[PDB]
Amino acid sequence: AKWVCKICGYIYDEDAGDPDNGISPGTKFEELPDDWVCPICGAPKSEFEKL
């Protein structure tokens, strides 16, 4: 699944993860650490919406 940051338009793609920020590919959005934030704009997880 892909989730969009409602603040800046960054798409968290679970297939891609966010390796530069310690998230390996295939990591589900719900599995992201609670302290994970949008790597672009810094938005907390609350600000993402599943597509």
When binding is defined by CB under 5 A, the residue of 11, 41, 44, 50 that contacts Fe ion is: 41
Q: Is 7 among the residues that bind Fe ion (CB under 5 A)?
A: yes
Contacts of 51 (CB under 8 A, 6+ apart): 1, 2, 3, 4, 11
Q: Is 16 among the residues that bind Fe ion (CB under 5 A)?
A: no
When binding is defined by CB under 5 A, the residue of 4, 10, 16, 29 that contacts Fe ion is: 10
**Minimum separation from the CB atom of position 14 to Fe ion (A):** 16
